[PDB]
Write an enzyme that holds these catalytic residues in place. Structure first.
Site, PDB file in Angstrom:
ATOM      1  N   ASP A  32      -0.180  -7.396   2.722  1.00 42.16           N
ATOM      2  CA  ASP A  32       0.212  -6.010   2.473  1.00 42.16           C
ATOM      3  C   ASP A  32       1.735  -5.917   2.327  1.00 42.16           C
ATOM      4  O   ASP A  32       2.410  -5.272   3.138  1.00 42.16           O
ATOM      5  CB  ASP A  32      -0.304  -5.101   3.595  1.00 42.16           C
ATOM      6  CG  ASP A  32      -0.492  -3.664   3.145  1.00 42.16           C
ATOM      7  OD1 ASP A  32       0.348  -3.155   2.373  1.00 42.16           O
ATOM      8  OD2 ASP A  32      -1.479  -3.029   3.572  1.00 42.16           O
ATOM      9  N   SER A  92       5.055   3.209   8.262  1.00 42.90           N
ATOM     10  CA  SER A  92       4.129   2.319   7.546  1.00 42.90           C
ATOM     11  C   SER A  92       4.905   1.532   6.504  1.00 42.90           C
ATOM     12  O   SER A  92       5.417   2.114   5.553  1.00 42.90           O
ATOM     13  CB  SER A  92       3.004   3.127   6.878  1.00 42.90           C
ATOM     14  OG  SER A  92       1.885   2.313   6.553  1.00 42.90           O
ATOM     15  N   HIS A 146       0.792  -1.243   0.000  1.00 40.83           N
ATOM     16  CA  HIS A 146       0.000   0.000   0.000  1.00 40.83           C
ATOM     17  C   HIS A 146       0.828   1.300   0.000  1.00 40.83           C
ATOM     18  O   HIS A 146       0.245   2.395   0.002  1.00 40.83           O
ATOM     19  CB  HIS A 146      -0.982   0.025   1.178  1.00 40.83           C
ATOM     20  CG  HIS A 146      -0.351   0.336   2.506  1.00 40.83           C
ATOM     21  ND1 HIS A 146      -0.353  -0.559   3.555  1.00 40.83           N
ATOM     22  CD2 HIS A 146       0.266   1.451   2.972  1.00 40.83           C
ATOM     23  CE1 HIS A 146       0.241  -0.016   4.603  1.00 40.83           C
ATOM     24  NE2 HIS A 146       0.631   1.202   4.274  1.00 40.83           N
TER      25      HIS A 146
END
Ligand SMILES: *[C@@H]1O[C@H](CO)[C@@H](O[C@@H]2O[C@H](CO)[C@@H](O)[C@H](O)[C@H]2NC(C)=O)[C@H](O)[C@H]1NC(C)=O
Ligand SMILES: *[C@@H]1O[C@H](CO)[C@@H](O)[C@H](O)[C@H]1NC(C)=O
Ligand SMILES: *[C@@H]1O[C@H](CO)[C@@H](O)[C@H](O)[C@H]1NC(C)=O
Ligand SMILES: [Mg+2]
Ligand SMILES: [Mg+2]
Ligand SMILES: [Mg+2]
Ligand SMILES: [Mg+2]
Length: 528
Positions: free
Chosen positions: A373, A474, A317
């Site tokens: 992810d 992230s 992502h």
């Protein structure tokens, strides 16, 4: 009128029977006795009918498994079954004639002596005589085992709805025996098979450049994984690049016989009273850490994790998310390594490197829960390690649990880049340790449901604790330190905990130990 034949359906199963009655109108005698053989095995499953009905037709283990007449070649482990016909490696104590009850055909597992362990077979492995087989038990339907290592079915398409390629297909044989498998796996036509002991599961090939491989959707049984140093080189240096020999051994700490301030604290069970906040990291404490910037604008995007001198992870992502318009080519991005001040440029400490190719895990799905992810990036030129740049070791199935039991806590090193795609802020790298929380307690604190692929971490909130959920970058590393071989292993790839907003609670990280082989096919795909 054979179509009739006073059918049993009503006489023998819709209600019981127990012989004679299988007499008035019924010829070919021994077939009345092979039926009876089946029927004596199904004995204890007389009610309901469907149970018995499905017992007699035998793809089904009842009790001690005598009734089985299905077609499974393989044992619990992966060993192929030695044909019952055979004496190599093992002369059988029980041949087709000595126990003509059970259907001892080909190599399909049976139980003619009704051993408490249930259906079994002779092994192709000379050191093992008989090893039991894992068979569909009656009424616990589906549930594939062994990550599809013993998959003998017929699935011929990927998770994304793409066509599997044939396992000769001109080039699909050209690249086949390039690498070793388990030959106890029957590689038919274009069906989804797991040759290479892939902890991720079964898979096949796809239309594109050589070595393209989507994975296959199958209901695997829930592996609840949460039940100088010597670490052997899994990868193939030429393709993967060097580093693995020495990974997870911090230049400034491990090699220098040095513990950092907060690592010894990790050992303890949360000494009921002592939490430690995200203070600044000291230097060389998370060397494998990486920062992903946009080229133009100069926009910091995501955290990452050095695993070699060549390959680096992140969160898919960070480059691909259609809810925004995230679709970054290699030419849009660069990474920085061994940094400490977020804002300053570290002169002669940090390395700037560009991308060569990007690889989004093929089973990445954002249209639900950010499943898989994960991404992978190679650098247009390799990177030279230092006391500031150094790679993290990757774990396998075995180390998961080993480290999730003995070791109680982990570690999130970051510039809080997850949190700060939301507010509008740490200036320098923050380290913080978080205990892994019991999965069930993590489950009933969140709406978005948790596969075995994801897990939860953080300290328990008790009405007076605010959510320190969202520590770290992230796509950055969650890490753990083995109290046996003394190396740093990455477990997590930080993802959005809920988003992050919703929290007064826990923090989420994707698993990684099942990657191993997916990686191995990619480094090959690209090349040496
Ligand atoms: C092991 O399983 C294989 C795979 O199904 C079996 O071989 C197949 O046999 C059927 C017919 O009996 C054929 O249609 C397939 O083409 C075969 N596949 C092969 C040979 O790769 C085999 O019977 C099992 N082995 C034993 C010893 O029973
Ligand atoms: C089966 O093995 C037994 C060993 O006791 C022997 O009596 C018999 O001749 C064997 N027959 C076949 C077909 O293997
Ligand atoms: C990104 O855009 C390019 C077209 O410029 C194309 O390669 C592709 O459609 C996009 N990438 C992905 C992964 O969807
Ligand atoms: Mg009926
Ligand atoms: Mg009758
Ligand atoms: Mg009668
Ligand atoms: Mg009668």
């Amino acid at each position: 009128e054979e179509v009739r034949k006073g059918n049993l359906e009503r006489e023998c199963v819709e209600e019981t029977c127990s012989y004679e009655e299988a007499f008035e109108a019924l010829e070919s005698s021994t077939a009345t006795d092979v039926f009876w053989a089946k029927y004596t095995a199904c004995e204890t499953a007389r009610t309901p009918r469907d149970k018995l009905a499905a017992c007699l037709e035998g793809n089904c283990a009842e009790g001690l498994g005598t009734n089985y007449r299905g077609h499974v070649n393989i044992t619990r482990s992966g060993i192929e079954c030695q044909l019952w016909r055979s004496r190599y490696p093992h002369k059988p104590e029980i041949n087709s004639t000595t126990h003509p009850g059970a259907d001892l055909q080909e190599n399909f597992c049976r139980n003619p002596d009704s051993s408490t362990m249930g259906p079994w077979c002779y092994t192709t492995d000379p050191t093992v005589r008989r090893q039991e087989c894992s068979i569909p038990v009656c009424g616990q339907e589906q549930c594939v085992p062994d990550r599809g290592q013993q998959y003998q079915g017929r699935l011929a398409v990927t998770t994304h709805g793409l066509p599997c390629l044939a396992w000769a297909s001109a080039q699909a044989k050209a690249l086949s025996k390039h690498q070793d498998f388990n030959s106890a796996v029957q590689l038919v036509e274009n069906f989804c098979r797991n040759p290479d002991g892939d902890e991720e599961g079964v898979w096949c090939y796809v239309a594109g450049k050589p070595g393209d491989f989507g994975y296959c959707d199958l209901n695997y049984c829930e592996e609840a994984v949460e039940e100088t140093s010597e670490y052997q080189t899994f990868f193939n240096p030429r393709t993967f690049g060097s580093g693995e020999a020495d990974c997870g051994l911090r230049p400034l700490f491990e090699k220098k016989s040095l513990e950092d301030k907060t690592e010894r604290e990790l050992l303890e069970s949360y000494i009921d009273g002592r939490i430690v906040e995200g203070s600044d990291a000291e230097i060389g404490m998370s060397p494998w850490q990486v920062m992903l910037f946009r080229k133009s604008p100069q926009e910091l995007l995501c955290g990452a994790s050095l695993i070699s001198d060549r390959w680096v992870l992140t969160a898919a992502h960070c480059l691909l998310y259609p809810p925004w318009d995230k679709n970054f080519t290699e030419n849009d991005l660069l990474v920085r390594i061994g940094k400490h001040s977020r804002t300053r440029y570290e002169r002669n400490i940090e390395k700037i490197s560009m991308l060569e190719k990007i690889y989004i895990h093929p089973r990445y799905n954002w249209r639900e829960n950010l499943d898989r992810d994960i991404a992978l990036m190679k650098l247009k030129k390799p990177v030279a390690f230092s006391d500031y740049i150094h790679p993290v070791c990757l774990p396998d199935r075995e180390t998961a649990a080993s480290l999730l039991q003995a070791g109680y806590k982990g570690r999130v090193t970051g510039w809080g880049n997850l949190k700060e795609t939301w507010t509008a802020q740490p200036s320098v790298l923050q380290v913080v340790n978080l205990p892994i929380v019991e999965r069930p307690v993590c489950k009933d604190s969140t709406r978005i449901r948790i596969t075995d692929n994801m897990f939860c971490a953080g300290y328990k909130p008790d009405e007076g604790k605010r959510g320190d959920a969202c520590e770290g970058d992230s796509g950055g590393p969650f890490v753990m330190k083995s109290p046996f071989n003394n190396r740093w292993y990455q477990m997590g790839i930080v993802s959005w905990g809920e988003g992050c907003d919703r929290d007064g609670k826990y923090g989420f990280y994707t698993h990684v130990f099942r990657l191993k082989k997916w990686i191995q096919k990619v480094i090959d795909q690209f090349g040496e």
